[PDB]
Amino acid sequence: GNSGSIVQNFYMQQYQNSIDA
Amino acid sequence: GNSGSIVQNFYMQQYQNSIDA
Amino acid sequence: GNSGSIVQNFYMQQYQNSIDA
Amino acid sequence: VTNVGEDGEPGETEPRHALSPVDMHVHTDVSFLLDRFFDVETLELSNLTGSPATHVLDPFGSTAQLAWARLLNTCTYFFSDLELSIQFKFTTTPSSVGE
Amino acid sequence: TSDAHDKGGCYLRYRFPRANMYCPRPIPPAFTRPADKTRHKFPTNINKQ
Amino acid sequence: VTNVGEDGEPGETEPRHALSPVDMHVHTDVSFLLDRFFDVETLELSNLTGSPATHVLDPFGSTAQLAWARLLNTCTYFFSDLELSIQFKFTTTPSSVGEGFVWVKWFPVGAPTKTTDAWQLEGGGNSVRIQQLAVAGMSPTVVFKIAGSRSQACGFSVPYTSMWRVVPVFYNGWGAPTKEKATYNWLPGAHFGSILLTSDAHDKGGCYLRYRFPRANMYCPRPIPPAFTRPADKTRHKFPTNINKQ
Amino acid sequence: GFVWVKWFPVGAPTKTTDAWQLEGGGNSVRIQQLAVAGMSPTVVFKIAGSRSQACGFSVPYTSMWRVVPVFYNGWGAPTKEKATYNWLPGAHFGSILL
Amino acid sequence: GKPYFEVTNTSGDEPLFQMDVSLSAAELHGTYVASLSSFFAQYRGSLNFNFIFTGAAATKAKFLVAFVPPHSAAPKTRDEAMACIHAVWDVGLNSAFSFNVPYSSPADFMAVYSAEATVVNVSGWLQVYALTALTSTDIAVNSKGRVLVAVSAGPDFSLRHPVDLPDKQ
Amino acid sequence: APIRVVSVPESDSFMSSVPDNSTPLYPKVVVPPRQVPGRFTNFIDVAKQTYSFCSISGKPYFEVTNTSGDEPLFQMDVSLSAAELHGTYVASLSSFFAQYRGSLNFNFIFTGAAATKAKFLVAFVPPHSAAPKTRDEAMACIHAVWDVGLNSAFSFNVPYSSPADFMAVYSAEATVVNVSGWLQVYALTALTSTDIAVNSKGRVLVAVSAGPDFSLRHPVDLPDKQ
Amino acid sequence: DRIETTVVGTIINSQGSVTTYCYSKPDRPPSTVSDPTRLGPTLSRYTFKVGEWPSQSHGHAWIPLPSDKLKKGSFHEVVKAHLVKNGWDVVQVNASFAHGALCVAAVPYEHTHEKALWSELEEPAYYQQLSVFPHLLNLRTNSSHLVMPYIGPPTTNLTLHNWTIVILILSLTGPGQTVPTMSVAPIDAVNGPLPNPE
Amino acid sequence: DRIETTVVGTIINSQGSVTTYCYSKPDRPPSTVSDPTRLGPTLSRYTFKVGEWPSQSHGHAWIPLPSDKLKKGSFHEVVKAHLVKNGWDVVQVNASFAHGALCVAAVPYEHTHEKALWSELEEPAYYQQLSVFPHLLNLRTNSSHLVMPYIGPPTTNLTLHNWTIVILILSLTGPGQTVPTMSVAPIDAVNGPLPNPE
């Protein structure tokens, strides 16, 4: 979704968002 | 065209511009 | 000449400067 | 050279020591010459209240020949994206809007 | 819309990236005609003095 | 060594324990010494209204010997790009321009001129005009405010405009078929361009132009102008330095 | 408040009277001759609203000496004078004109 | 005010067409090639012109063109002009002609804007002459012949440097 | 998402020697070739491969009469702002800087009648005494003797000898680093001519070539004009 | 032996010479002239007595190759009728035993008070540096050879843009007679013709 | 098609031409000149309106290439300052449908009453034989190409010894208008220079 910049993962996806299982 | 900086693709070309086919 | 920083080529040399032949 | 004109198509002559290129035409490149923020139009903002006059970005009108106007009307059809940059020249004492 | 509206204007601007043009057309003179046989003289960078 | 002089070409002697180099000459390198924003010139901006005096970036004049002047006139022909940095020293009470937009517009060798009004910003009444050729377009404009701006300055690149394969400093001949007193050392556009400064200011401040001459190439040496009177014979000239005595 | 911090390397001349002047509507404010920009690195920073009325930069070792002697036992000039004892011509890093 | 000159059987000496070869000289005012130019500041090209003779099919005119590099003050007779670079052409079976006004000057680019006499403004003149006064089946039916002056951009021609438009003058 | 940064206090300041350019507002400007010969990259270069007349008295040369002998002929305090070395290329170049580290060379172009001979002596006096004033005093130092007649000029290399790796391109009150000494030339044999009548004096040009180990370091703005 | 015979076109023999090429060797038609004559060996072959050296305080020189002195006879006629790409080849002086030196140099030249293009103007003394522009004559060793290549900001109108030679008196003394020369000459010589002068 | 474009130096296109080499092809420096210029392509590139053809009884011709008409502008200037080895290349006439023929010939030429070297002298009728000297123009077929080689008793002073072209009216009739030409030009062009004219 609307996040097409190569800086979005400055904060790795754990801190960024959530996680399912 | 007048965009010769290596930061232009911070936003990948989908968000940047359009697309044809 | 006095440009010893590794950011000088943010603008590629076409936009930066001129060109000879 | 003997030209059998009338059928459209131009006609050249080519001298001796023809001249070498340089510049490469480049500065005449359509997409290139048009990829630069021009100062076109200029309006008046809205008060938050009441009903607005929805402004429309139609830059295919020309008239004041600021070399961007003619250039757009050198072609028939045009397809390009857009990018804008509103600025806002204060009209009175630039210290009357604290926000 | 802004609490302003007065006390200022704007200066819109356009950056036309990916400009594709089709079907040429004639290019409009933009300058009157001069006096026959001669040059038109606009004060330039160059010029004389 | 016995010198058979007169035929130009110098003549050396070479002692014993010749001395090792260090520094590598380097600090005398033409392109290098000239790649730094100098403070050259200084002007007065334009009111948005009326007709302008198109300023021209011709840094081949010299006179006030600020070691950049002499250096440019050490060569015959010069070819380099340019880069500028306008600043703007307020001249009175630095709180009288609550905005000051400044339409620094650069022009390339040959660009037309005649700039009367044609723009106008409409808003609630009043409406403030902008110079016709000042607006944005073909030749790079920069809009910077003169209020709260922690550096009322700008700055950019300006690749070599002029038609000449190289820029001749001192010309011996003339510039136009009108062998006139003026066109002697003139030559049509031995320069880098122009600049038009317009802002609601014009007064209450100046500027300090600047030049960064990257890719400076120099040709045909010339003699280097003394810059200091002659002293009293036999002796030294004494300028108060870092060193000195006390 | 523009401040013309100009650094100078060991040996640079001095004598700085007026020579610059910024013309604008009247008044015109002078700048120090050697103060302007050029050879030896100038820095122009404002003293208003500046959330740190400060600057800062590099200054590689100027002085002629292979190394800087702190305490010198001898003298600095052939004028064996009370002063030039622990002086030695330019045992330093340069100057600055503000 | 028209795109063509005439050819009568009473000409001879006089010049037929003349103009100061610079992209804002009268004739080259309305042309595509010249009107394009003004978005810029510089050109480096030799131009071509094509002479489309339109007189009766019972008319012959024969003729002469000439390029006068900058120096004198406009030669005013072929006898003066023929001593320069010129071409002669005979309508009758051709049905038009082409002449390439080259590029010769010390500067690598010239001015797309004309101004007071400079070494870089003016590239010279372009001239055409009556090397043989026109002829017709009857001087009665066919008075004059005409000729179109079309301007094709040369093969080495290019514009460099975009520039905003000044005032309208 | 958004990167985290911190401005240095300095930040929005000038910097008249920032190793890095500015924003390229005009681009793609291809530039035409240059065919001019006699081009240069380095300034030392030109002063090494080129002499320049030192200004003695107001002229670039001293005399030689058949009434000299003892007296000094030419003298000057070897420092790049000493009188003679004032008008020279090599010395005038210098003032864009602050330091030099080189031994210099001088060439003595004798211009007297072709029926004239002068024979002669040069001498370098390192700093110490207060200017020897007779060759008998000066010859006890480093010197060279030369006989015009068939030579048609001469060359002497005033070396570099001092405890400091670089000296001052600017002269000032006596320092261990200003003065490198004197340069002296003497009448080791008073001039001679076919007739004292026709040929009175002989002359000699004093040309200054940058030495082979000489270099200028440190650019510096120009002070006041004095 | 100091045999200095130099030929172009006019065989200048002259002992006196002791062959200085200024900057480079002369060269290939203009880069910027899509325009069609390699002047021949005759024509591009002259010799002007310069002046008569005399109490002339170091600084005096004999000033612009070659206008004003161009009007003097076969090459001249040609450059009359646009532009010319040509270097030069060129000094001689008549003296003796009891005699002044000259720094004769080829300048690439400011000055000539808008009365530019041959005469007797002085120079501002600092001769101290005229030895930097490729170039002496010494009466105690000889009597003469500056050979230069083409220069200008790729070709040019020689009726408006001049290689200009000078001759400064570094140090004259001896017998009371005069001490009177220079053999100028184009090399590798012009684009498109011009209207008859009628 | 009758495309007749002829170039030397000046591109003469002219339909009208129907390429007569007179005697031979032009040639190798003089046999008798142990003397040192091959005039260039510019210079040796002219076009003189000859006269205006009018009741002109067969016999009238337009007389000597090229003196008197030499003074007309770059080549001219050169032959001024001894001898020249050069052939020529050269006629055109403006007519219609309702119109006289000319025997235009290159003569190797007596006559020109010691007022020799361009004008309107008649000839003695017996045009019956002028067709023997390499050479017509016929208004019922065209409007123009005599190309000749060098001749003289091995080279010569072109200010004293002239290839001289003529144009005789074998048979004019039609509409009352005039009927006005010729594009002259040296080829393979001169020995040693001469004193300045001062």
PDB file of N, CA and C in Angstrom, chain C residues 1-2 16-18 20, chain F residues 32 35 81 157 212 215:
ATOM      1  N   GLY C   1      39.953  19.463  -8.264  1.00  0.00           N
ATOM      2  CA  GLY C   1      40.017  20.744  -7.453  1.00  0.00           C
ATOM      3  C   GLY C   1      39.112  20.683  -6.229  1.00  0.00           C
ATOM      4  N   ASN C   2      39.307  21.595  -5.272  1.00  0.00           N
ATOM      5  CA  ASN C   2      38.547  21.679  -3.996  1.00  0.00           C
ATOM      6  C   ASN C   2      37.088  21.196  -3.930  1.00  0.00           C
ATOM      7  N   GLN C  16      25.840  18.887 -13.431  1.00  0.00           N
ATOM      8  CA  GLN C  16      26.852  19.480 -12.596  1.00  0.00           C
ATOM      9  C   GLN C  16      27.512  20.587 -13.427  1.00  0.00           C
ATOM     10  N   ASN C  17      28.427  20.118 -14.281  1.00  0.00           N
ATOM     11  CA  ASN C  17      29.252  20.953 -15.138  1.00  0.00           C
ATOM     12  C   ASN C  17      28.929  20.952 -16.611  1.00  0.00           C
ATOM     13  N   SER C  18      29.961  21.221 -17.385  1.00  0.00           N
ATOM     14  CA  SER C  18      29.819  21.204 -18.800  1.00  0.00           C
ATOM     15  C   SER C  18      30.485  19.927 -19.226  1.00  0.00           C
ATOM     16  N   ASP C  20      33.363  18.850 -22.768  1.00  0.00           N
ATOM     17  CA  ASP C  20      34.185  19.391 -23.868  1.00  0.00           C
ATOM     18  C   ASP C  20      33.727  18.598 -25.106  1.00  0.00           C
TER      19      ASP C  20
ATOM     20  N   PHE F  32      42.701  24.434  -8.843  1.00  0.00           N
ATOM     21  CA  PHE F  32      42.528  24.359  -7.405  1.00  0.00           C
ATOM     22  C   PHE F  32      42.423  25.754  -6.775  1.00  0.00           C
ATOM     23  N   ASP F  35      38.841  27.439  -7.451  1.00  0.00           N
ATOM     24  CA  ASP F  35      37.654  26.708  -7.124  1.00  0.00           C
ATOM     25  C   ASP F  35      37.167  27.170  -5.751  1.00  0.00           C
ATOM     26  N   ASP F  81      33.733  27.041 -15.425  1.00  0.00           N
ATOM     27  CA  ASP F  81      32.284  27.182 -15.238  1.00  0.00           C
ATOM     28  C   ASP F  81      32.129  28.289 -14.219  1.00  0.00           C
ATOM     29  N   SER F 157      24.985  26.317  -9.785  1.00  0.00           N
ATOM     30  CA  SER F 157      25.950  26.098 -10.878  1.00  0.00           C
ATOM     31  C   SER F 157      25.532  26.970 -12.053  1.00  0.00           C
ATOM     32  N   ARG F 212      32.635  30.808  -7.851  1.00  0.00           N
ATOM     33  CA  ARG F 212      33.326  29.565  -7.576  1.00  0.00           C
ATOM     34  C   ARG F 212      33.673  29.207  -8.997  1.00  0.00           C
ATOM     35  N   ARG F 215      36.641  23.935 -12.777  1.00  0.00           N
ATOM     36  CA  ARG F 215      37.150  23.549 -14.122  1.00  0.00           C
ATOM     37  C   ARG F 215      37.905  24.665 -14.861  1.00  0.00           C
TER      38      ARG F 215
END
